[PDB]
Amino acid sequence: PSCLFHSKLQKVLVEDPERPACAPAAPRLQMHHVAQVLRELLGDFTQPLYPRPRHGHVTFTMDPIRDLLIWAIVQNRRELAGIIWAQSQDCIAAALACSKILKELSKEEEDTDSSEEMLALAEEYEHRAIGVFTECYRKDEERAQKLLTRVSEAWGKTTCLQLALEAKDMKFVSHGGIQAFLTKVWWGQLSVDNGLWRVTLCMLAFPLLLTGLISFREKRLQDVGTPAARARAFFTAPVVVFHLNILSYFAFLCLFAYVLMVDFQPVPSWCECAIYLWLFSLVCEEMRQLFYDPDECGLMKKAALYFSDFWNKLDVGAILLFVAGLTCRLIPATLYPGRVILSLDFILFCLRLMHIFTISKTLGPKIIIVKRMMKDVFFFLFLLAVWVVSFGVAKQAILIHNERRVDWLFRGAVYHSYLTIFGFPEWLTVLLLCLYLLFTNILLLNLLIAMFNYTFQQVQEHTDQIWKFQRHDLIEEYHGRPAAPPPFILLSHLQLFIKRVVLKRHKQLKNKLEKNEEAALLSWEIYLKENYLQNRQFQQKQRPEQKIED
Amino acid sequence: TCRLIPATLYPGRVILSLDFILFCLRLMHIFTISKTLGPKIIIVKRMMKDVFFFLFLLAVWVVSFGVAKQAILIHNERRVDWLFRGAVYHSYLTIFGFPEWLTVLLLCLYLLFTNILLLNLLIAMFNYTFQQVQEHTDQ
């Protein structure tokens, strides 16, 4: 009862409302209760582990050992769970599940000693999962590739990699083989090695792909040339879809700029409706991004997660600004404001071009850096603002008499304040100018020196792993995104809408495998586990404190 | 050969002017033989690599702000050499560093994103590309 999990279980069980009739007041403890607190600790995406009965000799579950490991891990029993993990079923999912549960618990720990050990144990389990995975990958590559995409029926019908992404398993995803898997699924059907410029070259030319100017793995396509199927597999690769999408985006913004510049006119031209319908197709694709999830999570949680997306938040802000400016252009009396409102719309699109350099080798880290630095840029902006308006109202008050000029005094005062801030009257003039060079030209720049040296030096190392971690989700999106450009995404949109009107993830990310194949796979990894363990304890014997004890 | 063309005497001459610039950078080749300065040549040779890809992003930011500034405070005119040159001059004057509310909004955005952020990006990037190499360069 000293642990945090007992208090959380008691707070659930006391708030359990559906137990009306019994001899006592405190009804019972059922397994669906601890399943319910486990689901809220673990995340929304999994199913409930234990089912609720809709109502023998010995009732036996799918596996006892997982629940035993859960019982051991919620109470921070270290050496016990270290023992019983050796008899696991599929240890790679198991150590991930325990590290995620430990990380989700240790943040809410509210104790200055339990949180630290709770974190360190999760780090050790990360190391265990890494160590078994680097063994089984080194045994055979392509078979171990199948291990990640496999759904585990044990852990509530999920696969391990989305669980690791949920756990922020930063040391785990940074392994070479998993990144190679990501690169393999990123480069689509063809071979991986073509570089970047040759992709653009075959992007420019249609019949080059039918000729002998490009690579293919899966040599049936490389030897037997079916150029319809070859072009189909070529367009199926998400690099191609990404490049055509960014090209269509570039053409869309350029034509939007030209039509906004010279073709503004009160009657509707054809071009304004053209860019309007381009944006309309774009926001239908963005709505499709909201309405996909076959994992039946919270629709409120789905909209919160998509609203938690920074780029999606900027996108819907630009949509709201566009639909404000469109009805201001609809008013014939507000033509000059509404037009320049759309000008801001162009700015709210070009910031989307900062979305590119995540795919760069090096620049993505700097995007992470400026995303960090914005957080105190904001609350420094507030203080510089109140300082400069204090100096401005002082400058307005000193060298004039009291006049009620609403547009004469305020505008000239704001112009003088901006001229100051863009960087016998002799004694008072020297005092004003020396104060101006004193507080403005020195202090707050040094505040930014200290604050930004701090917010740089606090993070100037591990960001490469953060970029490697952040690599996944865009590949996830573009595998999910269809292959048509936003001028032609409507053909897919109508087909998907009528398909869901009259009536599923891809198999390359999640698949119910064959059971006898899965048993062979499980026996293989469970054979490799003991091979890991022997050398593990052998090298752990070689620490000098152990030899001192011996 | 531009000086060879008698009709292109003013461009070709100033082309050779750039030639003089392309020779004086060769004088940076000297201070490798210095005791101490050669390391700093190595340092700037390191720093050019992200100077380039920062230059791209500052360029697209300033041209976005420039086309915004062109679009806001004028009517639609087809001036090819009148509007574009004055717009580029106003953008360079900005980047070298009841209209009251809109003027305060434009000037506060100008002091907001330009006068703060990208300099701090260079602070972080160049503190990083300095501190990653600030030791073994003598060897």
Helix, strand or coil, per DSSP, at residue A159: strand
Please give the single-letter amino acid code of residue A288.
R
| Annotated resolution, angstroms | 4.4
A414 close to B103: Cβ distance less than 8 angstroms: yes
A260 close to A212: Cβ distance less than 8 angstroms: no
How far is the CA of B19 from the CAs of A13, B2, B4, B24, B38, in angstroms? 83, 13, 16, 9, 25
| Cross-chain residue pair B124–A347, CB shorter than 8 Å | no
Sequence ranges of the binding site of A for Ca(2+): 286, 289, 312, 477
Cα A470-A476-A479 angle, rounded to 5 deg: 145
Torsion sign over Cα A499, A502, A505, A510:
negative
Distance in angstroms (rounded) separating the CA atoms of residues A230 and A249: 26
Selected residues 324-353 of chain A with any CB under 8 Å from a CB in chain B? 339-340, 343-344, 346-347, 350, 353
SS3 track for A230-268:
HHHHHHHCHHHHHHHHHHHHHHHHHHHHHHHHHCCCCCC
Continuous segment of H or E residues that includes residue A151: strand A151-152
Distance in angstroms (rounded) separating the CA atoms of residues A161 and A65: 22
Q: Which of B70, B104, B117 sits opposite A377 (nearest CB)?
A: B117
Interface membership of A387 toward B (CB under 8 Å):
no
Distance in angstroms (rounded) separating the CA atoms of residues A489 and A249: 13
Distance in angstroms (rounded) separating the CA atoms of residues A510 and A513: 9
Helix, strand or coil, per DSSP, at residue A149: helix
Q: Which of A344, A414, A457 sits opposite B100 (nearest CB)?
A: A414
How many Cα atoms are found within 13 Å in the side-chain-facing hemisphere of B103? 12
A403 close to A409: Cβ distance less than 8 angstroms: yes
A200 close to A213: Cβ distance less than 8 angstroms: no
Distance from CA of A483 to the nearest CA of B (A): 28
A322 close to A68: Cβ distance less than 8 angstroms: no
Q: What is the largest CA-CA distance in chain B?
A: 65
How far is the CA of A91 from the CAs of A54, A143, A160, A320, in angstroms? 31, 17, 11, 48
**DSSP result, A37-59:** HHHHHH-SSSPPSSPPP------
Which of A199, A202, A220, A200 has the alpha carbon at shortest distance from A211? Answer: A202
Question: How many CB atoms sit inside 10 A of residue A138's CB?
Answer: 11
| Cross-chain residue pair B72–A377, CB shorter than 8 Å | no
Q: Which residue of B has its CA nearest to A408?
A: B100
What tokens does B33 get? Answer: 């033989």
Distance, C-alpha B73 to centroid of its chain: 26
Q: Which residues of A touch B99 (CB under 8 A)?
A: 411
What tokens does A372 get? Answer: 């960090």
How far is the CA of A367 from the CAs of A465, A520, B54, B122, in angstroms? 14, 45, 11, 12
Q: Which of B64, B70, B78 sits opposite A347 (nearest CB)?
A: B64
Mutate to test the interface with A, among B84, B121, B134 (most CBs of A within 10 A): B121
Interface membership of A461 toward B (CB under 8 Å):
no
Angle between helices A114-139 and A91-106 (to 10 degrees): 160
Residue A410: CB partners within 8 Å, gap ≥ 6? B100
Which of A470, A42, A9, A107 has the alpha carbon at shortest distance from A297? Answer: A42
Which of A262, A236, A260 has the alpha carbon at shortest distance from A478? Answer: A236
Please give the single-letter amino acid code of residue A152.
S
| Cross-chain residue pair B98–A257, CB shorter than 8 Å | no
Continuous segment of H or E residues that includes residue A152: strand A151-152
Determine if residue A3 is left, alpha or beta; phi over 0 gives left, psi from -120 to 50 gives alpha, anything else beta. beta
In the block, residue with structure tokens 């985006």: A249
Distance, C-alpha A373 to centroid of its chain: 19
Q: Which phi and psi angles does A435 have, rounded to 5°?
A: -65, -35
Which residues make beta-bridge pairs with A158? A152
| Cross-chain residue pair A344–B117, CB shorter than 8 Å | no
Distance in angstroms (rounded) separating the CA atoms of residues A314 and A318: 6
Distance in angstroms (rounded) separating the CA atoms of residues A357 and A246: 12
Distance, C-alpha A232 to centroid of its chain: 30
Torsion sign over Cα A540, A544, A545, A550:
positive
Torsion sign over Cα A82, A85, A91, A97:
negative
Distance in angstroms (rounded) separating the CA atoms of residues A318 and A344: 9
Angle between helices A91-106 and A31-42 (to 10 degrees): 80
Q: Which phi and psi angles does A511 have, rounded to 5°?
A: -160, 135
Helix, strand or coil, per DSSP, at residue A176: helix
Interface membership of A527 toward B (CB under 8 Å):
no
Distance in angstroms (rounded) separating the CA atoms of residues A302 and B35: 63
CB-based burial of residue B77 (10 Å sphere; 0-12 exposed, 13-18 middle, 19+ buried)?
exposed
Residue A242: CB partners within 8 Å, gap ≥ 6? A359, A478
Size of interface A-B (CB pairs under 8 A): 87
In chain A, which residues are followed by a C-to-N distance beyond 2.5 Å, i.e. a gap? 55, 423, 503
In the block, residue with structure tokens 């079916």: A226
Distance in angstroms (rounded) separating the CA atoms of residues A99 and A115: 13
Distance in angstroms (rounded) separating the CA atoms of residues B70 and B87: 6
Distance in angstroms (rounded) separating the CA atoms of residues A522 and A182: 23
Distance from CA of A176 to the nearest CA of B (A): 24
A293 close to A303: Cβ distance less than 8 angstroms: no
In the block, residue with structure tokens 């720093």: B47
Distance in angstroms (rounded) separating the CA atoms of residues A96 and A107: 17
Continuous segment of H or E residues that includes residue A158: strand A158-159
Please write down the long-range contacts of A446-449, taking CB distance under 8 Å and 24 or more positions apart: A447/A380, A448/A380, A448/B116, A448/B120
- C-alpha torsion angle, residues A246, A463, A147, A85 (rounded to 10): -160
Beta-strand pair A158-159/A151-152: antiparallel
CB-based burial of residue B122 (10 Å sphere; 0-12 exposed, 13-18 middle, 19+ buried)?
middle
Give me the helices (H) in A309-425, please: 310-330, 335-350, 363-398, 409-421
Residue A281: CB partners within 8 Å, gap ≥ 6? A486, A487, A489, A490, A493
A136 close to A177: Cβ distance less than 8 angstroms: no
Interface membership of A373 toward B (CB under 8 Å):
yes
Distance in angstroms (rounded) separating the CA atoms of residues A89 and A93: 9
How far is the CA of B27 from the CAs of A260, A451, B23, in angstroms? 49, 39, 7
In the block, residue with structure tokens 């403890």: A29
- C-alpha torsion angle, residues A344, A345, A351, A355 (rounded to 10): 170
Please give the single-letter amino acid code of residue A431.
L
Helix, strand or coil, per DSSP, at residue A61: coil
Distance from CA of A136 to the nearest CA of B (A): 35
A365 close to A459: Cβ distance less than 8 angstroms: no
Distance in angstroms (rounded) separating the CA atoms of residues B38 and B11: 37
In the block, residue with structure tokens 């990123």: A186
Q: Which residue of A has its CA nearest to B120?
A: A452
CB-based burial of residue A441 (10 Å sphere; 0-12 exposed, 13-18 middle, 19+ buried)?
exposed
Residue A510: CB partners within 8 Å, gap ≥ 6? A149, A151, A159
Question: How many CB atoms sit inside 10 A of residue A311's CB?
Answer: 13
What tokens does A35 get? Answer: 């399943």
Q: Which residue of B has its CA nearest to A370?
A: B121
B66 close to B92: Cβ distance less than 8 angstroms: no
| Cross-chain residue pair B76–A347, CB shorter than 8 Å | no
Interface membership of A448 toward B (CB under 8 Å):
yes
Question: How many CB atoms sit inside 10 A of residue B73's CB?
Answer: 13
Distance in angstroms (rounded) separating the CA atoms of residues A275 and A493: 19
Distance in angstroms (rounded) separating the CA atoms of residues A411 and A418: 10
Q: Residue A48 gets which letter from DSSP?
A: P
Distance in angstroms (rounded) separating the CA atoms of residues A174 and A285: 32
SS3 track for chain B:
CCCCCCCCHHHHHHHHHHHHHHHHHHHHHHHHCCCCHHHHHHHHHHHHHHHHHHHHHHHHHHHHHHHHHHHHCCCCCCCCCCHHHHHHHHHHHHHCCCCHHHHHHHHHHHHHHHCCHHHHHHHHHHHHHHHCCCCHHHC
What tokens does A109 get? Answer: 């720990």
Continuous segment of H or E residues that includes residue A302: helix A299-308
What tokens does A79 get? Answer: 């050496």
What tokens does B79 get? Answer: 């001036």
Selected residues 61-90 of chain B with any CB under 8 Å from a CB in chain A? 64-65, 67-68, 70-73, 76-78
| Cross-chain residue pair A456–B124, CB shorter than 8 Å | yes
Q: Which phi and psi angles does A505 have, rounded to 5°?
A: -75, 165
| Cross-chain residue pair A354–B64, CB shorter than 8 Å | no
In chain B, which residues are followed by a C-to-N distance beyond 2.5 Å, i.e. a gap? 97
Interface membership of B34 toward A (CB under 8 Å):
no
Interface membership of A459 toward B (CB under 8 Å):
no
Which of A153, A3, A137 has the alpha carbon at shortest distance from A72? Answer: A3
Cα B48-A469-A233 angle, rounded to 5 deg: 90
Q: Which of A344, A377, A452 sits opposite B123 (nearest CB)?
A: A452
